[PDB]
Amino acid sequence: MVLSEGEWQLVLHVWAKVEADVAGHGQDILIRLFKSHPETLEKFDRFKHLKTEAEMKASEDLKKHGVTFLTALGAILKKKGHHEAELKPLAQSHATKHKIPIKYLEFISEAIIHVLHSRHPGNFGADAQGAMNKALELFRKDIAAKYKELGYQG
């Protein structure tokens, strides 16, 4: 796919809001994912033992990885589709080292959309959500293409 400039503007406008509090958004999204899809937590040797949401919120390690992840994602979105270079090292580590199936990338996409809808209802109307979903779909399509090339495809 290819997003229009109008669609990228909707994505980047809400993302600017997200950037006012990177750690907080990173925390909310990861917790959303872990509660919605508990199996995903089993991929993190460092977070695997966290039993409750209270423990997840208190984990400094979890908050740090949330910032690392959001920062990587923000760098990709800001490329407005020209993210080939950024996708390479990311697809290799997640396919070969972490072994994250494509199914899981869909789970986190839903979590991101849920949190943005919760914290920014005014800047995340129907048009803005469709634009963000289009951006994430584009990301997943390219990542899956890289997975194939790397010999994985999960």
Ligand code: HEM
């Ligand atoms: C938009 C999606 C994603 C982005 C931008 C992203 C980004 C990152 C980044 C930057 C790291 C750091 C270095 C590395 O690549 O190993 C990382 C690590 C990791 N990611 Fe992701 N990731 C994404 C989705 C996921 C998903 C869906 C899972 C699991 C359900 C996952 C599991 C992991 C694991 C297991 C590690 C390493 C943790 C550690 O031992 O430090 N990632 N990810």
